[PDB]
Structure formats: structure tokens, C-alpha cells
Design a protein around this nucleic acid. Structure first.
Ligand SMILES: C[C@@H]1CCO[C@H]2Cn3cc(C(=O)NCc4ccc(F)cc4F)c(=O)c(O)c3C(=O)N12
Ligand SMILES: [Mg+2]
Ligand SMILES: [Mg+2]
Lengths: 40, 264, 52, 25, 270, 40, 194, 142
DNA sequence: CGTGGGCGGGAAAATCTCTAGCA
DNA sequence: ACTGCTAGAGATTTTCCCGCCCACG
DNA sequence: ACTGCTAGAGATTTTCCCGCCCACG
């Protein structure tokens, strides 16, 4: 990662790393927004 | 981007909103929003003395058995623990448990004999916790602590038929007060408020820890159509094509080829 | 609290805040957007001409 | 109207007009 | 130093904090943070992360005693080829192992034995036998069974094939001989697809044919190479040429097996 | 491997894979002629 | 001989107080004249002796020119330890080579200048053949020109140490803790970078 | 800079004339206070430059005391070939630690010791007193 | 006499890999 | 209908910085 | 002065063959 979230459901999550469109299941996902956002 | 700073400045002159509103609305870096809220005159409120470490302590004796109740008073979160014997070791053990779960910064209590043990002093010395005795931080929630204790006694009067032992019904009661009590502005039961307060405190203290090293640094800079190296200005945002600084009172942008950053 | 590292240099006490914060933010934003945006996509699939 | 926040960043007037538009129908 | 460094030291006295935590919480360079991590002696890590190398030389042979069905089994392995012998032991003692090693030395060109620090492998009888046969004795780290891990894996494999071969025989030793025959001949694969019996024949034949032939070569060819080394103008020599290259030759001056380019070299017939 | 041999002693053997000079010690060498030499 | 041993003593020319000093490794005269029996001029001379080379100690006699609070305050401010022969020879051979320049000069301190240079640079002999001002450089500047280990003993989880290295191996290291010559593998031990 | 070459300069402070001498290849100063600005005192300054430390020549300014007949006779039987920023760093360090100084000379002494052994740096955290002996070591060992 | 840019030397930071131990 | 995983140490690649000096204004 | 190692299974990449068919002689 870190990929960009596109759509969230309940069993799967659509993300985009650079140009691929990955459908990652819910038991494999990690979604967070860092406190380090203040620079980037 | 850079032309929204002045219309955030006049916005802070007319309405004096904090750095979060001017940062999220104008899509600014938060450092220039904290400097806009810093450069104001009437927007300079008090310091810390807000706090996520507002914690009230209160003992009670129900069914001839000690229940020690802690309240996270900043969010209204409350929990308790059944204590077998009144001594300072039990209070120090429960305080170290509370410090292990949540970042307890300051505790408010009375001058009770059990809460004045030197074991609790050694525990808070090993923890680094400011302590208050009998002094309310603000007198609004002072009655609300007692009213929440009476509310939890009403929940005990609900759920005493839900469990055999005292502490099992106590855990069911604090589960109910954590989840089965709704209302408020956006339907938060008890945990969403405290995780919002803790997340905002963590983010603003990360911003404090980020900005506390930048103010030591110096940026000597020249301008375009200029070789006069002015400064040393104060860095706001280091960029790849444009660096944001402030020399005296103006938020300026500079090319990196015109910049020179002292490392200390 | 004291042990830092892992994913983004935080302790586990910060990640357990951030995970539940994203939990009670993102799906509520999704519930707020799913009642507004409702677009119906008809698609002509591969190797075929049927607009499904 | 100058103070916002919450899940969607709502004010009080837009929230109460949304709940009144819900309550009418 | 700074007061934050001293308070990070107090943090290290109370919690033994990470270097990155002290670097983040007090805006420190990582070198002094790793020094403060290395300061207190209670903060000792789990050592290095790299495995050693076991010798692959034809003159070395490993031994081990293993246990199965309440009986002791002597196993011997040639390290370069993987050729295995095994036998049942009457009783675990140094004299019978010395007899087994004398049979091994009488059947095979054995120079070095590398075992663990067991009781039967430290007797005076095997010492007298290895002195009689001129065998270099060597042992390993006293509680590291990984240098003998080749023969440990070969104890695993032979017992696995014994699990396949136990039903054909009434007793242990017949199945042991059948299994070691199966592994030394029928098991094919590895480097060039062969069993270890052809591989040890290849090892000993290549060893003899590539020591006697170079012994006959080195008494005829004798070229003396002088060399002007790099970064310097001194013509140093003479050196013994090992093999003439195309643009760079390989020589030995006194002890260094080195490469010198031919433009920086000068070869003399005698 | 398999590299070509250049000179052999007892302690170390020098070989050449493509252009390198590998002074491999005796404890790491493997001197075998593969008997599928009957084609190459 | 230590790389920082110096020796201070006194001489009275016409009842006039000068302070002589000598490095024990070379026997190297330096000197200063003081106007009166004071301690401020002594600390003056001590840190002017340190003024170009680092000084580790100063050797004195048992007089009261080293038991005062000014010189001890200065030497403990700088960090030089105090402690109260090789000087008594050259202090006798400091009053002899003035005779080439004594009556040949109006001021006698010019004869002191020329005599201390003729002692400094134009005095050689012995094994090395250098001058004394170069002999002290040779001695100290040849004096100007080791890790710990920890280990986990096998069949145990407790880590011990520290110990000193003996010989480096690519799989195991041999070490001495105090007198225990032990060989420990690199997967069970760990060496400090310094 | 050749390791036999040194440099001199003068200054005036609190009514007292002080003189600095440096090694140009290293940069460690040595100052000394004299009562009267006479040629005797600067010839003794040439003594406390030359008689211990490995000098070859001299380097100072156009003062008449620096080129007197006493100085020229001292260079005559001292082999010194008279040819022809060292003060501001000393004037920085004296004012911070003037408080432990009953006289100005002790302040000069503690300031040059701060310059000696309390400011570590270079390539290995060295002093200037090590650098001068390393350069004259290269001279005596080449 | 007054400036610019690549280089190199060094720091330093992100990732690769690899292992110890959980009985 | 279920599932190996995670903290630390060199090691190696990737990248700013600085000073400097040789090439240029 | 000493040192983890080796046999087997998908899995994945790399590479002849054949037939064939579409492009050409
Ligand atoms: C009495 C229950 C009933 C069920 O069986 C036993 C036995 N057991 C064995 C281990 C153990 O061997 N851990 C080390 C380990 C080794 C290899 C690996 F891949 C993973 C690993 F965790 C445990 O940790 C554990 O909790 C139990 C346990 O609880 N029980
Ligand atoms: Mg064994
Ligand atoms: Mg075994």
C-alpha cells in the first residue's frame, strides 16, 4: 500500500494502488488516515 | 490555494473560527491556519490548565462492598470497579489499569484517606500524572458526576436480575451505559464521543510535535528578480517547487533554488 | 503506549483509535452518500452485444 | 451558519430542515 | 546535552523505550537514540540473522548415533557426496564406534571426522584408533546440532524410508540394510540425477585425476610473472603463474592468489 | 555453477564462470564431471 | 612516560623569581619570569603552558606556590589534576650559555632569548639525533598512534555479558568474560559496534 | 602552511596590552598580557613563541616594537627569517566567563582553555592542540 | 574578479531479508 | 464450514547537502 | 581456533512442435 479507497461495502472493498483496481475482501483490509497528513 | 489565505484572514477577523475550520474549508495546510489563529489578538484564549485528561474519581459503598468509579469527564465516559478492601494499593492498581488503557493525564478526586496513600504517589510518579484534591476543573459537570452515579444505580436496579454476582451485573451495567444509552447530536452512545476526542487530541498533539521542531529552524531566502538574501524567515511548509515561509508578518512563497534552510 | 513502530511509527493504542475512528466515519459517510447518488449503469459486456 | 461539524459537517439549520423534510412525507 | 535527551534517558530508565519513540517524542537524530538504546544493559536484542557454512570437502565424514525402537543406530555420511552407511549398535560405547570407524577407514579414504560432543564419541578408544589410522578428529559447538544437521536430515530421511520398508522384514537390521541399499542406489536426483554411489565415485576419480595431472603439469611449466601493480610504478616480482588468461592472468606472489592484467604484467620463461 | 577450473592446489581452487576470478576455498568447492558429458 | 607529564619548579636569579618547566619524556626547558611571589602569574604560566599543547598534569615541589586557592581553582576549572629529579639538571644548565651574549647585549632578556633558542633547536645527540623540540613531538605524536560482546548461552533464554573478543570467525566467536574462554555462535551472540 | 611558520598580532583591553600568537596550520591561540607596550615585552613574546615551540620564521604587523634591534639580534641567534581574525574568537569567550576572573589574565587563560578542550570537532571530535601536533608530526616524520 | 553546476563524500532513510520463539 | 504470524539487525539501495572547485559571467 | 541442511510439490516461467491456415510462390 497505501492504495486509495474507491467504494466500501461489507464484504469487499474497492481500492486503487496506482492504476490497478483491486477488490480486496473485508478480512484483508486496513483503512486508516495518518496523523502525518499535515504535510502530504 | 495561495490566494485563499487573505480570505481566510478576513474570515478570522470577522468570525474568529479556529484553525480546523479555515484549514478544512479553504483546503490549506494546517500550519498557516494555526499561524492565522496565532496572529490574532482576541483569539488568544487560555492554555491547558481542551484537556482529554479530565478524570473524576469517586468511591461508593453499595451492598456493603466498595465500588470505585472513574469518569472521563471530557467526553462523559464512565466506568467502575468492585474493590474488596479499602487500601491505597487497590486504588493504585486500578489507577495503573486506567493508565494502561487510556492516557490518563490528570485526575480529580476528594481528600479521602484511601486516595492519599504513598503507593499511589509512587505509581503516579512512575506514570507522571498531575493530581487534584477537592478542586473541580469546571463546576458544570460537578453535579453531573453524581447524576451519572445515580443513573448507573438506576441501571443496576434494571439489571440486578440479569446476573447473579455484583460485579457481573456491574459489567453488564457499564456495557449498557457504553452502548444502550443513545441521544445527543448525532446518535452517539458513549464510545464515539471519546474516540473522537482522543483522535482529535492525538492529531493536534502530533501537529504540536511536528511544529515544535520547525520553529528552531531558519530559512534564508532571496526572491525572484532579486539576489538579496533576506531572512531568516520561519518555515511553514517545505515543498518540491514552492516553499512557504513568513519573514516578518507576510505569508510568502519562494522557489527552492532561492531557499537555504539552516538545520538548527 | 511506550513501544513505537509497526505501520506508521505509532503504538497500538493509536492504531486502535484510528481503526475505530475510520469505522465510525467512513461507513456513515457511505450511508449518507448511498441515499443521494443512485446511478443505473447498463453495460455491453465483452465478446457480446447485449446491453445488460 | 458559521459553525459546522459532525459526521457530515452539518450546521443546525440544514440538519433540522433535513429532518423536517423527512417528517413531512 | 538537551533536556529532552535527559528526559528520554529517564524514559529509558523507566520503560526501556524504542529508539524511534525517543527520536519522535523529542526531535532527536537516530544515532544518539540507538546509543541510548544500547546504553542500558537490559536492552539486548536477539543476535544476528545469518546462518554459517558447513565445509564441503572430500576428506571429511560425519557420524551420529540416533535412536529408534529403543535401539541405537550408527550413521556415517560423506559430506561431499551424501553417501550414507548405517548399522545397529550392540551397546553405545567408544570401542564399537572405533571398530566401525576402522571399517570405514579400511573401505574409504577418510581423513577428517566431525561429530558432536557425545559420551561415546569422546572415549579414549576412538582417540587411539584415530591416532593409529592418522585421522584428524574435530568436534563442533557443544550445544549446536546444526553443524551436524546434514546427518540429522539423513537420519530423518533414512527413518522415513524405514517406515516404507519395515513391513518386508521381520527385524530391524534387515530392513536397515535394505533401506540403505535403496537410498544409496535406487534414489535418483540431486545434482546430476544420480544416486550418491555414482557421485562419490565421481568425487574420488576427479580428485585423483585432477591432483596427479596437475602434479605432472607443474614440474614442466614454470613462468615467472613480474607485475607493475595499480596506483604505483614499481615492477614487483617474480610470481608463479597459475593460468594464462586473455587480458588478465592469475598469479601467486608469496601467498596472495591475485589477478594481474597482462598490460600490467611481464611473463618470463625462466 | 558450473564454472571452468583454472588451477587447483589444496587450500583454494580458482574458477571462472563467465569472466570472474572466483578463488573458492576447498570447503566450498564441488569438483564433479557430470556424466551427461556424452552429448556436450 | 605519560603523554602529558610536565614538571614545574622555581629559580631565583638575583633573588628574582622565575618558573621553569620540563617535560619528563624529553627534558624540555620552558620558563617565565614573575614580578612577585604570587599565584595569578602561576596560573597564567600554567594555562600558557597549555596554550598550544594539551596538558594532562603538572609536577611541583612541596612549597606554598601550589597550595593556594587561585591556582587550584584555575586547574580544577580547566580540569588538570594537581599533585605535590629531571628539572634540577637543566635548571643548573640554564645559567651557562648566557655567556656568549651577556655582555654582547644591552638587555639581558635578549641573551635569554638567544640562549633558550640555542638550547631548543641546536641541541641534538644520542640515538635519534633529533632536536628536543622535535623529540617531544616524536614522543607524543608516536603516542597518538576493542569491543564488547553479549551472548545467549545455549539451552537457555537468559542473555549474559559483556565479554572481550579473542578471534573473529564467520560462524562463531571466541571470547573471554573474565577468564572463561568460550566459543559462542553468531546466531546466539551479538557484538557491540564499539 | 609550513609547520615552522607562526603568526603574531596585538590588542588592547582594559588599559592592558595583550598579544596573541597563533599556529596558522591549526588555529589554537595563545595570548599574554604585558604591563608596558615596550620592545622588551614583545621580544619576550618572541621568546614564549620560539623557545619551546618549533618555529622557523615570524609574522606580525608594522609596529616599531616588532622590528627593533633587540628583536633582530634575537632572530640573529635564533635563526628566524623576519617576514612582514586571531582576536575576535578570544574576545567572544572572555566576556561570557569574565565572572571567574579576579584579573584579566585569568579570563584570557580560561578562554583559551575553552578554545582548547571544551569545543570538540573536526573529523573525530578533536582539539586544535591535537591538530598542531599532527601537522608538525607529519613534518618531523616525512 | 564574481557565480553555477556536477561530483563526491557523507549522512540518512526506505526497503529486503531473514531469524527467534510462541510449549 | 477454514487458513501462520510479528518485532528487530544488518545490508543494500535511494537520496538530500555541502563545499568546492573547476567551469564559466 | 568456528559455521544449518536436504528431499519433494506446485507454480511459474521459458521453450520446442505441429498443424495450419493464411499468406504467399
Ligand atoms: C491445551 C490446549 C489444547 C490444544 O493443544 C494444546 C497444545 N498447545 C501448543 C502450543 C504451541 O506449541 N505453541 C508454539 C507454536 C509452535 C509452532 C507454531 F506454528 C505455532 C506455535 F504457537 C500453544 O501455544 C498452545 O496454546 C497449546 C494449547 O493451548 N493447547
Ligand atoms: Mg547426535
Ligand atoms: Mg542427532
Amino acid at each position: 500500500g497505501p492504495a486509495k479507497l474507491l467504494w466500501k461495502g461489507e464484504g469487499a472493498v474497492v481500492i486503487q494502488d496506482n492504476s490497478d483496481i483491486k477488490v480486496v475482501p473485508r478480512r484483508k483490509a486496513k483503512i486508516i488516515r495518518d496523523y502525518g497528513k499535515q504535510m502530504a | 490555494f495561495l490566494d485563499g489565505i487573505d480570505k481566510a484572514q478576513e474570515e478570522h477577523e470577522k468570525y474568529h473560527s479556529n484553525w480546523r475550520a479555515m484549514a478544512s474549508d479553504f483546503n490549506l495546510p494546517p500550519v498557516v491556519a494555526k499561524e492565522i489563529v496565532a496572529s490574532c489578538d482576541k483569539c488568544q484564549l487560555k492554555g491547558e490548565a481542551c484537556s482529554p485528561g479530565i478524570w473524576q474519581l469517586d468511591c461508593t459503598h453499595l451492598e456493603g462492598k466498595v465500588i470505585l468509579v472513574a469518569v472521563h469527564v471530557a467526553s462523559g465516559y464512565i466506568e467502575a470497579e468492585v474493590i474488596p478492601a479499602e487500601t491505597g494499593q487497590e486504588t493504585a492498581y486500578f489507577l495503573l489499569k486506567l493508565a494502561g488503557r487510556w492516557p490518563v493525564k490528570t485526575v480529580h478526586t476528594d481528600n479521602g484517606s484511601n486516595f492519599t496513600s504513598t503507593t499511589v504517589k509512587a505509581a503516579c510518579w512512575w506514570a507522571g500524572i498531575k493530581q487534584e484534591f477537592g478542586i473541580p476543573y469546571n463546576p458544570q459537570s460537578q453535579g453531573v458526576i453524581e447524576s451519572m452515579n445515580k443513573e448507573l444505580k438506576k441501571i443496576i436496579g434494571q439489571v440486578r436480575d440479569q446476573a447473579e454476582h455484583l460485579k457481573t451485573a456491574v459489567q453488564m451495567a457499564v456495557f449498557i451505559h457504553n452502548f444502550k444509552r443513545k441521544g445527543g447530536i448525532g446518535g452517539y452512545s458513549a464510545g464515539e464521543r471519546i474516540v473522537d476526542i482522543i483522535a482529535t487530541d492525538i492529531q493536534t498533539k502530533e501537529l504540536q510535535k511536528q511544529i515544535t521542531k520547525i520553529q528552531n529552524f531558519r530559512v534564508y531566502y532571496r526572491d525572484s528578480r532579486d539576489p538579496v538574501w533576506k531572512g531568516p524567515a520561519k518555515l511553514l511548509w517545505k515543498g518540491e517547487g514552492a516553499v512557504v515561509i513568513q519573514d516578518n508578518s507576510d505569508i510568502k512563497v519562494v522557489p527552492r533554488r532561492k531557499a537555504k534552510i539552516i538545520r538548527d
